[PDB]
């Protein structure tokens, strides 16, 4: 499976999706998604 975890450590809302995916993998993660309205990311990795 592939968990989706809210990013721990991301600024704000997700204006910048390229940010998301280093906060993603600067937290040991895949790659990150931007969820809902974008103004929230996400993380997701294999678990």
């Known amino acids: 499976r592939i968990c989706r975890r ?8 997700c204006v910048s999706n390229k940010n998301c995916a280093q906060v993603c993998m600067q937290e040991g993660w895949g790659g990150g998604n931007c969820d809902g ?3 929230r ?3 997701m990795r294999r678990c």
């Not at 809210?6 to 809302?13: C, D, Q, T, V, Y």
């Open 6 to 13: 809210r990013s721990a450590g991301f600024k704000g809302p």
């Open 41 to 43: 990311c996400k993380c």
């Open 37 to 39: 309205p974008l103004r």
